[PDB]
Amino acid sequence: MAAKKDYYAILGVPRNATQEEIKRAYKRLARQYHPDVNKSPEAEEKFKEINEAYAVLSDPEKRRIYDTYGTTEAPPPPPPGGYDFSGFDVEDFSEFFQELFGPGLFGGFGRRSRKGRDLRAELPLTLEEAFHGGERVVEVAGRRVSVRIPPGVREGSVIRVPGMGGQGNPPGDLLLVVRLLPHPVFRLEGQDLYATLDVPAPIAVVGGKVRAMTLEGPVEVAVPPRTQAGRKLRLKGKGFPGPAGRGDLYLEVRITIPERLTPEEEALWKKLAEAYYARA
């Protein structure tokens, strides 16, 4: 009931503070009042107030909800799912907070307050944009909120975002099931990929080179002398990014022919065929 808490002051930043410097003040008091680092329930409740201010000043949406509050006075309409509070104990925050986020107060660490609405969202995405991904804002279920997902994904597979789903105490969270574009060549497992390489039969026998178009650049594949279809490559450092380096691209070899030939080409191919008939 109108007990407007100044979230800037809770974090110790001014009424002008940038969202990033607001997050700096959060980090300061997130080290200071960190529940298990500083074994003090007092500091855990103060940490909740740090996480309250941050809950409303973390992402572009929530940020501008507060910035428009005191112009808009009516709390935001409930997004069909809930207000996401990843590690933020909404249930133990202020009655002011219970006004502003009331119709979807989650229940994070309220112990029962709601069952986690497991919010599973499908998303059209590319393999090169799986490699990119990064720090980006998504609007799901009427609920705009930003996250940095781990760069990398596989067709039909799920990206977890812990706590950032619909209303609940038992983690409902956001579950991004990727819908890859007409380009799902690279099938992920961890950092390692699985695509198919179109290798000409003459190039496969001599051990020449065939280009595989990869996420960050076109790799030119060195083939061994005489390669069969069903063989597999592991292109070292051509997967998604890791601490030691990128994963390994697994290419399934297809041995394929250009159909159409020159008199020279076709003549030698027929002499090879005659060498084959000679085996019987």
């Binding site: 002008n16 969202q19 700096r24 980090k27 940020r63 590690g87 497991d118 599973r120 499908e122 998303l123 090169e128 944009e129 490699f131 990064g134 720090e135 998504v138 279920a141 009427g142 940095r148 997902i149 760069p151 597979s157 799920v158 977890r160 812990p162 706590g163 099931v177 380009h183 060549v185 497992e189 950092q191 390692d192 695509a195 179109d198 000409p200 001599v206 051990g207 020449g208 960050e216 650049g217 076109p218 030119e220 594949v221 060195a222 061994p224 002398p225 390669t227 069969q228 279809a229 069903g230 063989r231 597999k232 592991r234 070292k236 450092g237 998604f240 601490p243 030691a244 159909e259 020159t262």
Partner: protein, 471 residues
Amino acid sequence: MKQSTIALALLPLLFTPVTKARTPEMPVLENRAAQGDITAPGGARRLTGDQTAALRDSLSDKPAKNIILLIGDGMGDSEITAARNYAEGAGGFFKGIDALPLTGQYTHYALNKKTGKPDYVTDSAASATAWSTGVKTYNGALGVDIHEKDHPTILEMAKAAGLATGNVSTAELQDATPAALVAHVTSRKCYGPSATSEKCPGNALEKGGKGSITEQLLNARADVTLGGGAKTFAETATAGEWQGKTLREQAQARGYQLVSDAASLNSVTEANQQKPLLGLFADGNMPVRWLGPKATYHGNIDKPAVTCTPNPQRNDSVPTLAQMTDKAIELLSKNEKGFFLQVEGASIDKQDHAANPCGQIGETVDLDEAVQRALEFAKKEGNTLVIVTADHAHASQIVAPDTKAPGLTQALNTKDGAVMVMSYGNSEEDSQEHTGSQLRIAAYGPHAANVVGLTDQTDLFYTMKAALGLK
């Protein structure tokens, strides 16, 4: 063997599979042995120069083009109206808060006209910022990451943002016209939770750093060429390792070539750039896209057995593992004061100021998953094939090598061998001369032209090249 006789399913239950040797995600293997990875010293995208080609020319496609698609027009407006704002609301009254945001249909702002034609190379971009990039922080311990549940909630409004454009790009950034990333719930379909992902990672946002600047989104120019610019490929062996690649380049041809090697039989054809040591068109697969999703499988549902996951740091090393310090960022020492800031509309809130990594943003985070993003699921292998796909052999037909061992026999795994031998299989395959034989090959190749002419219609073409294989 001779099966012949059969049974029935009835569908009383769903047959569950049996677990195999899988997931060494606990002794972390770095996989940096013979990796190469960073062999080219930086490289980056080579996009810069004091103008190079396309100036004045710019490829004149579309009748003027100008405002691509969203011309609107107003007095000649049609079709595109129904897509969005088919009503407007009220020309004035209350809805009409403005009326002329075009202002004589675009004044002299700079040039405007959209188009996306003048230049593609003349820019000050370092061309290293490929949108964004993040690793799985550190090598750590790995494993424990399972999580997956399902969803009691499905569908929403729609939000088919872009649906062709948006976060699409090609290698580097080429377009960004969605909500920002993506936008919607499972509003079309969903296969299954633990079906497609027995282990979905999420707690792995690395760190970031050395940024504090990102205003130059333009790597190249705009739309047609907004990134990449120039990335040529020509190297001995950038591949990696497989089967037994002895370091041999081969494939030169230069021996005689009748008269000369450099084209010879052809002088010029438009531009093309074919016969240049490798080109023509080549490269199959490209979109691939299977329509057959194997199975959906809506099982292994909820399962909230994952104890460790809602803990934000507890018994960790220190939030100064990843790089320790990239530069400074927190204390940038840019200016003696907090800028001039008089009235810039607002403050420079921006959602950004210097990025600056969060507290324990990537370093274990108790669960350890901060340094992990899965590793195992189904590598497939495929070498389990060849060994009698009917009876599975079970000794007798082949007893000494079950698989992997075939080395004296050579062939090296093989996997694709549906025939090879297969038939008979040391068992009574009767065969004889039977009616099942009946066949008439009508696959690609023997169609039209040579066969019975083109067809029984005026649908006929003289398209038959003899000296070169071409349509």
